[PDB]
Design a protein around this nucleic acid. Structure first.
Ligand SMILES: CCOCCOCCS
Ligand SMILES: [Mg+2]
Ligand SMILES: [Mg+2]
Length: 314
DNA sequence: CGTCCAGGTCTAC
DNA sequence: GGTAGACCTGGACGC
């Protein structure tokens, strides 16, 4: 009871609650669906991971999101700590209101939304998001998830151990820019993305003026932010859109991968009309992103997250 | 066991 | 501009 990952049943006094209906949040549809790669369902309905530099376990009942933290004596999370959870889930954004809107303007969205409630966007750290999505390219979620864990294990600071799992914070730019990072990441199975991690960490610190440059894209425009990210090695349109949506507070950013292509054709009979290219291409991928913005409006990326997630499950 | 595929990015024509 | 091929890996899918 004192050791291992906590459950709600087994250590009741160490949990605290955040009011939040399952209609506003389904952990099981958000945490393994390729937004963040850093959460594991270590016991049934309990998700463990690192969030604002500490380890947490999260579980839900119909009206509550229950939260425990591992930091000192074992105790309930504090009000300030609980805030970090609220911010990470962006719980001020009311998902019932967005679903209504998207539902009204798109009857296909209405149909999928009935069976896939509580899919919202996490608000992620820019560095973690940048380097996770560099690992995402031409890859599947199961393998990306391992790549990311091994990366944090080798280069990130040791937080705490539960059972046989040692949690690590996400690596700094400095660690990722270090000597022989590529060769090390190649032995950890990252393949060609090993080079991209080293190169982007160095590009940021040595050519772009460091962490500040990345962080300040939050206050910049989607279009400025998206252009700025594309200069980095391993960061194309898609990876940049993932970062803008998931880390830089750009809700209108819509990543366009093979899933979204399939969704467009199957469920909207979409075809490009500004370019003569039949398939995925820079100009057809731009157009498809514009189609979804025009359809769903300024939170189109959030709508994308609902159908993307629902397409993973089918 | 050989292709094909997964939250693509690159350069080269 | 739209197009093709190279780059890691390891599960799923046939033949
Ligand atoms: C998909 C292969 O290209 C990845 C980005 O270019 C190489 C720099 S690390
Ligand atoms: Mg606690
Ligand atoms: Mg780039």
């Amino acid at each position: 009871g004192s050791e291992g990952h906590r459950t709600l049943a087994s250590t009741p006094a160490l949990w605290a609650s955040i009011p939040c209906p399952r209609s506003e949040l389904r952990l099981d549809l958000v945490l393994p669906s390729g937004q963040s790669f850093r959460w594991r369902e270590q016991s049934p309905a309990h998700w463990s991971g690192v969030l604002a530099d500490q380890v947490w376990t999260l579980t839900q009942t119909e009206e509550q999101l229950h939260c425990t933290v591992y930091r000192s004596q074992a105790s309930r999370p504090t009000p300030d700590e609980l805030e970090a959870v609220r911010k990470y889930f962006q719980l001020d954004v009311t998902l019932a209101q967005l679903y209504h809107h998207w539902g009204s303007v798109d009857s296909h969205f209405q149909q999928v939304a009935q069976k896939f409630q509580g899919v919202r966007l996490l608000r992620q750290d820019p560095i973690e998001c940048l380097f996770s999505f560099i690992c995402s390219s031409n890859n599947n979620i199961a393998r990306i998830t391992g790549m990311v864990e091994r990366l944090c294990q080798a280069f990130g600071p040791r937080l705490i151990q539960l059972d046989d799992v040692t949690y690590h914070g996400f690596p700094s730019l400095q660690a990722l820019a270090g000597p022989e990072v590529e060769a090390h990441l190649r032995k950890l199975g990252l393949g060609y993305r090993a080079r991209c991690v080293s190169a982007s960490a160095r590009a940021i610190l040595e050519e772009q003026g460091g962490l500040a440059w990345l962080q300040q894209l939050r206050e910049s425009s989607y279009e400025e932010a998206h252009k700025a990210l594309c200069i980095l090695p391993g960061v194309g349109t898609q990876v940049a859109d993932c970062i803008c949506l998931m880390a830089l507070d750009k809700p209108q950013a819509v990543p366009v991968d093979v899933h979204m292509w399939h969704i467009a054709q199957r469920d909207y009979s979409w075809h490009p009309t500004t370019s003569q290219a039949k398939g995925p291409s820079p100009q057809t991928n731009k157009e498809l992103g514009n189609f979804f913005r025009s359809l769903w409006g300024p939170y189109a990326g959030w709508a994308q997250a609902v159908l993307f997630s629902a397409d993973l499950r089918q």
